[PDB]
Amino acid sequence: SQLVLILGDQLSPSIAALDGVDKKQDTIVLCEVMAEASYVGHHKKKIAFIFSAMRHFAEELRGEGYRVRYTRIDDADNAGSFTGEVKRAIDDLTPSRICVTEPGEWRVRSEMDGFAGAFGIQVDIRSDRRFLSSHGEFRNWAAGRKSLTMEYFYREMRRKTGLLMNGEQPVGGRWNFDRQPARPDLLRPKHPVFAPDKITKEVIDTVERLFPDNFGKLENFGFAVTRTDAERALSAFIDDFLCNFGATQDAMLQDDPNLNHSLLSFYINCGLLDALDVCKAAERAYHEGGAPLNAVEGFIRQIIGWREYMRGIYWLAGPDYVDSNFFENDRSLPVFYWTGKTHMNCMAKVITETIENAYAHHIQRLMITGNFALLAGIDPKAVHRWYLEVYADAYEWVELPNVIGMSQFADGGFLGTKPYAASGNYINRMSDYCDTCRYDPKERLGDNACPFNALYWDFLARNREKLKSNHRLAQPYATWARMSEDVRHDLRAKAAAFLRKLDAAALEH
Numbered sequence: 001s002q003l004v005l006i007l008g009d010q011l012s013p014s015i016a017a018l019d020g021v022d023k024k025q026d027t028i029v030l031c032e033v034m035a036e037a038s039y040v041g042h043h044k045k046k047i048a049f050i051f052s053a054m055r056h057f058a059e060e061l062r063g064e065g066y067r068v069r070y071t072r073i074d075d076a077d078n079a080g081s082f083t084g085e086v087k088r089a090i091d092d093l094t095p096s097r098i099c100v101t102e103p104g105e106w107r108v109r110s111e112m113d114g115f116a117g118a119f120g121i122q123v124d125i126r127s128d129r130r131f132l133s134s135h136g137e138f139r140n141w142a143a144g145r146k147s148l149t150m151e152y153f154y155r156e157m158r159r160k161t162g163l164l165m166n167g168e169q170p171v172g173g174r175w176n177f178d179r180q181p182a183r184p185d186l187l188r189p190k191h192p193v194f195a196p197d198k199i200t201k202e203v204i205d206t207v208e209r210l211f212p213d214n215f216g217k218l219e220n221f222g223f224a225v226t227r228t229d230a231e232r233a234l235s236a237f238i239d240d241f242l243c244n245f246g247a248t249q250d251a252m253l254q255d256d257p258n259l260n261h262s263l264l265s266f267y268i269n270c271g272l273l274d275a276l277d278v279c280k281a282a283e284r285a286y287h288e289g290g291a292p293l294n295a296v297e298g299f300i301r302q303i304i305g306w307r308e309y310m311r312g313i314y315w316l317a318g319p320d321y322v323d324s325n326f327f328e329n330d331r332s333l334p335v336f337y338w339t340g341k342t343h344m345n346c347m348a349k350v351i352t353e354t355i356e357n358a359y360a361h362h363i364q365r366l367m368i369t370g371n372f373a374l375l376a377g378i379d380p381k382a383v384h385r386w387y388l389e390v391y392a393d394a395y396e397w398v399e400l401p402n403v404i405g406m407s408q409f410a411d412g413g414f415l416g417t418k419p420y421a422a423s424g425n426y427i428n429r430m431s432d433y434c435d436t437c438r439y440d441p442k443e444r445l446g447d448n449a450c451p452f453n454a455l456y457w458d459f460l461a462r463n464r465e466k467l468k469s470n471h472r473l474a475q476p477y478a479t480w481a482r483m484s485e486d487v488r489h490d491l492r493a494k495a496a497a498f499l500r501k502l503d504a505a506a507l508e509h
């Protein structure tokens with residue numbers, strides 16, 4: 001018989017490890033374990049989402065006719081780790097083989113690779129065919145390629161999948177349709193939410209009981225936790241938001257946390273939705289005239305371009321990519337990242353959305369909390385931990401390259417992005433956050449000055465030797481060079497006063 005281990009982000013009835021299962025003889029194992037619930041301090045809603053999705057999936061598999069051994073977080077003999085639980089299951093089931101689909105984090109891969117030796121049993125670790133490119137295929141794509149860029153990889157994925165392809169030509173005559181702020185729109189429909197069912201309510205109470213001090217609030221839990229509801233969330237995106245997806249992609253609004261985003265990452269990343277299925281649904285809408293090409297291509301590029309690319313970079317870069325620190329930063333994460341208590345209105349709103357919802361959209365993760373940590377010279381490892389904890393779609397393979405590469409430039413541009421530093425001028429143009437902020441995005445000195453303004457210049461000045469050759473930063477550096485000595489001095493002093501506030505606050509925390 002086989003022991004078929006399925007991890008919490010592998011919740012698909014067509015996951016590779018299910019190939020060739022004898023339903024009468026084999027047993028599927030799923031386990032809620034403290035090692036996985038504690039490796040970082042996951043958002044309360046993230047733990048509840050994963051455990052509930054796992055419990056519903058176990059019931060889904062039993063309905064399909066599988067034998068399932070399920071370990072709850074609160075079970076008396078819970079062995080505490082994948083290894084412990086597989087050992088318990090071996091003793092129970094006496095299998096001749098273990099089958100498992102390859103995982104999404106170095107830490108878990110290391111643990112899984114230890115099974116064969118630990119148990120003296122054959123362990124078949126299967127390639128995860130939910131991704132378009134295997135580890136070997138990405139490595140060959142990268143080989144001899146001195147400059148890795150998503151643009152190049154994306155073309156390969158378009159060709160491989162045939163998405164938006166007219167034979168060998170991209171639909172519409174260009175590969176990429178690639179920005180404006182949005183206006184409040186009370187006619188934009190609400191995104192779908194799903195009321196907690198019996199299983200979910202029990203999970204929620206358990207998470208509060210066992211993880212009472214974890215980041216985040218559980219109130220108004222509304223994630224889909226079943227395959228059907230995840231598909232309803234997809235349908236809602238196609239029907240209500242996709243047509244405007246491109247138009248508002250980089251916009252931010254105080255009173256509109258979701259805008260035209262899909263809010264599907266949580267489901268795609270744990271197996272409740274399939275990345276390719278999602279892209280195909282968008283493509284079908286395009287051909288029915290339901291959305292313009294810029295919206296549909298924009299959407300598909302984020303999934304078969306960015307998402308796939310980040311996975312490839314993560315595995316190519318190796319476990320010590322997490323130690324990337326191009327700017328040699330050592331500042332701790334500010335405490336307001338945990339509380340949302342800051343006079344910077346943009347930061348307060350984004351962090352509050354994060355506390356309440358375990359979600360923020362891309363340009364918030366990049367240009368608000370990401371940009372701030374970049375400019376404030378935060379230790380990239382501290383930034384990584386926070387992003388991995390606080391979002392219900394976060395797993396190391398996807399979070400880490402977004403943090404180290406795209407946002408923090410802590411890899412010095414390995415994954416092909418350019419530094420995203422921006423001042424209050426950017427945030428004022430792309431959001432309405434400044435409208436109710438105590439600071440003035442037009443001012444750089446004085447008590448009313450937006451903190452991002454002097455910080456932006458200080459970031460460029462302190463890192464000039466490493467960044468001066470960067471083409472994106474040519475104009476800012478030329479502007480800096482034309483500033484008088486006193487102007488430069490005063491900007492750096494203003495930034496230093498703010499960084500001193502951070503450093504003084506960190507000491508007591």
Ligand SMILES: Cc1cc2nc3c(=O)[nH]c(=O)nc-3n(C[C@H](O)[C@H](O)[C@H](O)COP(=O)(O)OP(=O)(O)OC[C@H]3O[C@@H](n4cnc5c(N)ncnc54)[C@H](O)[C@@H]3O)c2cc1C
Nearest residue numbers: 261262263264265302306307361362365366393394399402
């Ligand atoms: C600092 C930082 C950390 C991030 N951490 C995560 C993470 O832990 N998990 C995660 O899934 N995404 C992460 N992202 C990427 C992106 O912000 C999220 O995928 C997106 O916010 C999910 O919301 P959505 O489903 O509404 O996406 P939409 O705006 O609707 O986009 C559609 C889909 O494209 C994908 N996607 C879009 N952008 C990216 C990206 N840059 N990388 C990978 N996939 C992308 C997701 O599958 C998403 O569902 C991060 C980005 C930044 C800048």
Ligand SMILES: Cc1nc2c(=O)[nH]c(=O)nc-2n(C[C@H](O)[C@H](O)[C@H](O)CO)c1C
Nearest residue numbers: 007008009031032033036037103104105
């Ligand atoms: C919080 C959490 N809990 C569990 C769990 O109890 N059991 C489980 O199988 N998976 C969990 N996960 C997902 C994993 O920690 C890990 O991030 C993925 O397996 C990576 O591929 C997470 C994130």
Ligand code: SF4
Nearest residue numbers: 344346427434437450
């Ligand atoms: S003035 Fe500065 S701190 Fe305030 S909302 Fe605007 S960008 Fe954020």
Ligand code: NA
Nearest residue numbers: 102103104128
């Ligand atoms: Na995987």
